[PDB]
Design an enzyme around this catalytic site. Sequence first.
Site, mmCIF file in Angstrom:
data_model
loop_
_atom_site.group_PDB
_atom_site.id
_atom_site.type_symbol
_atom_site.label_atom_id
_atom_site.label_comp_id
_atom_site.label_asym_id
_atom_site.label_seq_id
_atom_site.Cartn_x
_atom_site.Cartn_y
_atom_site.Cartn_z
ATOM 1 N N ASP A 272 2.365 -8.175 7.106
ATOM 2 C CA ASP A 272 1.260 -7.484 6.458
ATOM 3 C C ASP A 272 0.074 -8.338 5.987
ATOM 4 O O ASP A 272 -0.529 -8.019 4.961
ATOM 5 C CB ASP A 272 1.766 -6.638 5.270
ATOM 6 C CG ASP A 272 0.817 -5.488 4.934
ATOM 7 O OD1 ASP A 272 0.316 -4.847 5.876
ATOM 8 O OD2 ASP A 272 0.611 -5.211 3.733
ATOM 9 N N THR A 273 -0.248 -9.424 6.681
ATOM 10 C CA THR A 273 -1.393 -10.215 6.236
ATOM 11 C C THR A 273 -2.375 -10.264 7.401
ATOM 12 O O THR A 273 -3.385 -9.546 7.384
ATOM 13 C CB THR A 273 -0.995 -11.642 5.788
ATOM 14 O OG1 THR A 273 -0.172 -12.281 6.793
ATOM 15 C CG2 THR A 273 -0.195 -11.615 4.465
ATOM 16 N N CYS B 24 -1.568 -20.294 -0.168
ATOM 17 C CA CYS B 24 -0.817 -19.746 0.971
ATOM 18 C C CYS B 24 -0.131 -20.767 1.892
ATOM 19 O O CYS B 24 -0.772 -21.722 2.360
ATOM 20 C CB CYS B 24 -1.732 -18.822 1.774
ATOM 21 S SG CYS B 24 -1.000 -18.222 3.296
ATOM 22 N N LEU B 25 1.182 -20.641 2.060
ATOM 23 C CA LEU B 25 1.929 -21.518 2.972
ATOM 24 C C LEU B 25 1.733 -21.177 4.423
ATOM 25 O O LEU B 25 1.922 -22.034 5.293
ATOM 26 C CB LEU B 25 3.423 -21.492 2.622
ATOM 27 C CG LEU B 25 3.714 -22.216 1.318
ATOM 28 C CD1 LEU B 25 5.123 -21.923 0.886
ATOM 29 C CD2 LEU B 25 3.480 -23.747 1.387
ATOM 30 N N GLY B 26 1.323 -19.941 4.688
ATOM 31 C CA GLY B 26 1.162 -19.450 6.069
ATOM 32 C C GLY B 26 -0.250 -19.594 6.606
ATOM 33 O O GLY B 26 -0.572 -19.096 7.679
ATOM 34 N N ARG C 94 0.844 -1.182 0.000
ATOM 35 C CA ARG C 94 0.000 0.000 0.000
ATOM 36 C C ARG C 94 0.883 1.238 0.000
ATOM 37 O O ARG C 94 0.915 1.980 0.989
ATOM 38 C CB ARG C 94 -0.877 0.045 1.253
ATOM 39 C CG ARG C 94 -1.938 -1.062 1.329
ATOM 40 C CD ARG C 94 -2.793 -0.971 2.627
ATOM 41 N NE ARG C 94 -1.922 -1.067 3.790
ATOM 42 C CZ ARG C 94 -1.333 -2.189 4.212
ATOM 43 N NH1 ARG C 94 -1.587 -3.363 3.633
ATOM 44 N NH2 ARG C 94 -0.443 -2.138 5.168
HETATM 45 C C1 HEM Z 1 -4.829 -13.673 6.639
HETATM 46 C C2 HEM Z 1 -3.571 -14.086 6.408
HETATM 47 C C3 HEM Z 1 -3.056 -14.447 4.992
HETATM 48 C C4 HEM Z 1 -3.662 -14.272 3.796
HETATM 49 C C5 HEM Z 1 -5.108 -13.801 3.462
HETATM 50 C C6 HEM Z 1 -2.705 -14.689 2.793
HETATM 51 C C7 HEM Z 1 -2.957 -14.788 1.438
HETATM 52 C C8 HEM Z 1 -2.099 -15.370 0.501
HETATM 53 C C9 HEM Z 1 -2.352 -15.461 -0.923
HETATM 54 C C10 HEM Z 1 -3.664 -14.988 -1.590
HETATM 55 C C11 HEM Z 1 -1.277 -16.088 -1.492
HETATM 56 C C12 HEM Z 1 -1.098 -16.453 -2.973
HETATM 57 C C13 HEM Z 1 -0.582 -15.238 -3.768
HETATM 58 C C14 HEM Z 1 -0.430 -15.594 -5.254
HETATM 59 O O1 HEM Z 1 -0.920 -16.679 -5.768
HETATM 60 O O2 HEM Z 1 0.255 -14.790 -5.958
HETATM 61 C C15 HEM Z 1 -0.328 -16.404 -0.461
HETATM 62 C C16 HEM Z 1 0.924 -17.014 -0.645
HETATM 63 C C17 HEM Z 1 1.872 -17.114 0.337
HETATM 64 N N1 HEM Z 1 1.722 -16.861 1.700
HETATM 65 FE FE1 HEM Z 1 0.004 -16.156 2.601
HETATM 66 N N2 HEM Z 1 -1.581 -15.188 3.450
HETATM 67 C C18 HEM Z 1 -1.733 -14.925 4.783
HETATM 68 C C19 HEM Z 1 -0.814 -15.212 5.780
HETATM 69 C C20 HEM Z 1 0.488 -15.601 5.612
HETATM 70 C C21 HEM Z 1 1.525 -15.715 6.638
HETATM 71 C C22 HEM Z 1 1.324 -15.391 8.140
HETATM 72 C C23 HEM Z 1 2.629 -16.183 6.011
HETATM 73 C C24 HEM Z 1 4.043 -16.452 6.568
HETATM 74 C C25 HEM Z 1 4.555 -15.693 7.530
HETATM 75 C C26 HEM Z 1 2.338 -16.336 4.614
HETATM 76 C C27 HEM Z 1 3.224 -16.882 3.665
HETATM 77 C C28 HEM Z 1 2.937 -17.043 2.327
HETATM 78 C C29 HEM Z 1 3.923 -17.483 1.376
HETATM 79 C C30 HEM Z 1 5.384 -17.826 1.726
HETATM 80 C C31 HEM Z 1 3.209 -17.591 0.060
HETATM 81 C C32 HEM Z 1 3.754 -17.936 -1.341
HETATM 82 C C33 HEM Z 1 3.450 -19.399 -1.660
HETATM 83 C C34 HEM Z 1 3.821 -19.620 -3.108
HETATM 84 O O3 HEM Z 1 4.076 -18.635 -3.875
HETATM 85 O O4 HEM Z 1 3.972 -20.791 -3.503
HETATM 86 N N3 HEM Z 1 1.005 -16.069 4.415
HETATM 87 N N4 HEM Z 1 -0.881 -16.008 0.761
HETATM 88 C C1 CAM Z 2 0.037 -11.632 -1.974
HETATM 89 C C2 CAM Z 2 0.719 -11.978 -0.670
HETATM 90 C C3 CAM Z 2 -0.356 -11.904 0.414
HETATM 91 C C4 CAM Z 2 1.414 -13.341 -0.756
HETATM 92 C C5 CAM Z 2 2.211 -13.389 0.543
HETATM 93 C C6 CAM Z 2 2.598 -11.932 0.848
HETATM 94 C C7 CAM Z 2 2.008 -11.208 -0.382
HETATM 95 C C8 CAM Z 2 1.901 -9.665 -0.284
HETATM 96 C C9 CAM Z 2 2.799 -11.752 -1.540
HETATM 97 O O1 CAM Z 2 3.835 -11.135 -2.184
HETATM 98 C C10 CAM Z 2 2.457 -13.201 -1.872
#
Ligand code: HEM
Ligand code: CAM
Length: 405
Positions: free
Chosen positions: A242-243, A348-350, A177
């Site tokens: 930032d999620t 999402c891995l997280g 943002r």
């Molecule tokens: C409400 C919490 C969360 C939301 C809504 C969210 C949402 C997402 C989304 C929509 C993607 C896919 C993005 C794409 O396809 O380009 C993603 C990927 C990912 N997220 Fe999350 N996320 C959250 C929390 C977190 C947290 C806490 C972590 C780790 C600290 C995390 C780690 C990742 C990583 C490492 C990926 C990339 C996986 C890949 O590219 O194969 N996420 N997430």
């Molecule tokens: C779209 C996301 C939520 C996902 C994890 C952090 C984020 C900003 C990315 O660059 C991939």
Amino acid sequence: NLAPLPPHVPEHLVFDFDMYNPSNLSAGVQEAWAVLQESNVPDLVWTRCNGGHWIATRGQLIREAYEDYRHFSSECPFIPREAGEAYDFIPTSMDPPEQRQFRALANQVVGMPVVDKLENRIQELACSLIESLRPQGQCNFTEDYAEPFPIRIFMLLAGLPEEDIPHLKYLTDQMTRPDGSMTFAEAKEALYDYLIPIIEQRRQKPGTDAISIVANGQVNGRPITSDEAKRMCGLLLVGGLDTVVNFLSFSMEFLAKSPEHRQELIERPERIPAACEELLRRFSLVADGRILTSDYEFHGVQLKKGDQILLPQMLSGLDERENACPMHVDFSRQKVSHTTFGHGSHLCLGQHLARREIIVTLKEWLTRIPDFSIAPGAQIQHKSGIVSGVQALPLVWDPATTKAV
Ligand code: HEM
Ligand SMILES: CC1(C)[C@@H]2CC[C@@]1(C)C(=O)C2
Ligand SMILES: [K+]
């Protein structure tokens, strides 16, 4: 300002939606994005804002595009084009097949087994923050809980000093943002500048923290490079900072405004996991995208190689073709359809860490502070971008109605 309409893009599909400042923002950010699903808006529109790009508006197209990595590549996944081009986080900037060996490593630092190991500390921190707030009868939810809770957990996991949060949080926010002081490339450069010496240090002297694990990890049985480790650690940092931070504020704003919903979770604690899922649908908050690898006809629209397409994860669950009465929060909703955590190979891995943080927050807050509301007079403002959020959330309550555990 509006980029000139490319020759190939039909005039009748133009809908100039600005993902970083949507017209209807004052009605709430999900509401503002949901204008793309009003009657007479096509399934796939072109906006001339932010350099020009496609937007899929309905969960059917969003899902399909996310499944088809051969046409819709994650090499350039952010709008505007400068940010997507600079964006090189791993695994997100890679398509299968090469993406997968990197996911497996990342899964080792944020996956279910790690979340289970964090469970007690997650619980303790929630309790310490909420108990400290309880007697005060007010708080600034964004700064007093939504930020410290998930962020301190991530910094613990990563073995990073909490005093580094203000700098790292600023940088991560410029990627999602931007306030305009930094381009995405400048913010990325600064995140990598922070990381480079810590990655080097932890390859020389491996610890047990997530950066050490990534930086000394193997991918499909070969050693990860310094550069790859940096690109993965950077992404983990953005995910951690930032999620969930933003999501907790949408949820808490809603619970503050809805006594009947809080009452349901107070009378019926067993429903909290389901409520978590229905809030993740209703207050979905991410919107990134893909780039066309070739000219391609998709749902009767000619897409050209290089075109960007925003595929908003936020929109699938808000689509009335996936969920009847989608703007209504129903914790008993039978089939909660959404793509809040993405779709396809970049799921999402997280998400296990995220849901644990959300469920622990709901359980612990409603136990100690069952009754609260928005500060009288407060005009709650949302902000839109790759991840949307809440500017400020002043809450109030009467300490006399709270409970010590
Ligand atoms: C409400 C919490 C969360 C939301 C809504 C969210 C949402 C997402 C989304 C929509 C993607 C896919 C993005 C794409 O396809 O380009 C993603 C990927 C990912 N997220 Fe999350 N996320 C959250 C929390 C977190 C947290 C806490 C972590 C780790 C600290 C995390 C780690 C990742 C990583 C490492 C990926 C990339 C996986 C890949 O590219 O194969 N996420 N997430
Ligand atoms: C779209 C996301 C939520 C996902 C994890 C952090 C984020 C900003 C990315 O660059 C991939
Ligand atoms: K790129």
